[PDB]
Design a protein around this ligand. Structure first.
Ligand code: 1U3
Length: 358
């Protein structure tokens, strides 16, 4: 790598790893469109396996960016519309609270207080219908944002229904394959298990557990190389040959709602660039187990703004991920770690690196 990138990345990430006691980490910087990779530590402490450019990490909620783009692609194909009622795609959802809840609301956490998690007790499909039928919104649709796997997860499941493909099949054929993300998985195949890092939670090796709507909300695993390619694709969607996918990427970066200085896309979240670092650093803090915020509708949504800090944090029990990029500057970063360490430390490190390179 150019010495500037080497120095900025190492001076930022080495202390982060020490302070957060991260077992293993991979970073990619995209600078003027090209990727530069860095790795530290261990994918598997007990077996002494190092992190490499081929190591798979759990992306956790960064998976929502893939869901948002897959949904965008389904819109571009004419299979769904975000203005469609949820009940168009799930007629069995007859309970009256669903009146007025659209796919847009599901995709952007604005349905009226769908919960962060689908309950663990929900295992069967009939359990899932029961859960959504019985859910009582706290708020009218389109008035408050409450980040929720049960919301965007349902969006992803419904978005692929008209295609007749499973969510995984749709993701593979419509997103992963065209973008050449050949080491990106919803279910890690046996052939790739040697590369699947362990996550570490309180010193114990852990992988994400199966759950309802997992694939749709938090279920992608990927390498640092594929994630750099994902950032490149989202930085420059016009280079993508597949028309509906190019369009879907753009739709996912549209600004649908505003809360504070943040704009909600499909999976992606955005701020105007230049950003107040304190605003993204502090704003990334989970606070917080539940953070209900009034939203303002952006009517109609603003098409993808190039002068944006576009980002997403992700976690599973054992992993912590972060992706951020600035389309106007052809600049981006991916940070994958096998410990779920605090979001503000992720965002602070990413901002230090990108600000130094911008
Ligand atoms: C934030 C956030 O958004 N989704 C998850 C999540 C991921 C996998 C399983 C369950 C959840 Cl809620 C999560 C988070 O904080 N995950 C950490 C964890 O699962 O321990």
């Amino acid at each position: 790598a150019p010495q500037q990138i080497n120095d900025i990345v190492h001076r930022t990430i080495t202390p982060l790893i020490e302070q957060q006691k991260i077992p293993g980490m991979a970073v990619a910087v995209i600078y003027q469109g090209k990727p530069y990779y860095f790795t530290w530590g261990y994918a598997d402490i007990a077996k002494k396996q190092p992190v490499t450019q081929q190591t798979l990490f759990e992306l956790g909620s960064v998976s929502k960016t893939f869901t948002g783009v897959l949904g965008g692609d389904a819109i571009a194909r004419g299979e769904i519309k975000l203005s469609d009622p949820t009940t168009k795609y799930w007629p069995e959802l007859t309970a009256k609270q669903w009146n007025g809840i659209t796919l847009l609301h599901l995709a952007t956490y604005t349905a009226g207080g769908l919960p962060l998690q689908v309950p663990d007790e929900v295992k069967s499909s009939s359990d899932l219908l029961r859960f959504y039928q019985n859910w009582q919104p706290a708020w009218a649709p389109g008035t408050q944002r409450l980040y929720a796997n049960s919301s965007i997860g349902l969006f992803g499941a419904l978005a692929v229904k008209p295609s007749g493909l499973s969510f995984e099949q749709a993701m593979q054929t419509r997103v992963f394959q065209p973008l050449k993300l050949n080491h990106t998985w919803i279910n890690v195949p046996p052939a790739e298990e040697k590369n699947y890092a362990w996550g570490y939670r309180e010193g114990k090796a852990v992988h994400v557990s199966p759950g309802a709507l997992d694939a749709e909300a938090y279920g992608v695993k990927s390498t640092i190389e594929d994630m750099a390619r994902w950032v490149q694709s989202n930085l420059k969607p016009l280079d993508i040959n597949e028309k509906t996918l190019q369009q879907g990427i753009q739709l996912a970066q549209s600004r649908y709602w505003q809360t504070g200085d943040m704009y909600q896309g499909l999976g992606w979240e955005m701020l105007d660039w230049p950003v107040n670092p304190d605003s993204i650093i502090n704003g990334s803090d989970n606070k917080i187990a539940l953070a209900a915020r009034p939203v303002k509708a952006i009517t109609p949504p603003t098409p993808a703004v190039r002068a944006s800090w576009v980002h997403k944090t992700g976690a599973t029990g054992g992993f912590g991920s972060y992706v951020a990029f600035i389309p106007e500057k052809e600049l981006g970063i991916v940070m994958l770690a096998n410990k779920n360490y605090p979001n503000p430390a992720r965002v602070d490190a990413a901002w230090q690196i990108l600000n130094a390179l911008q």
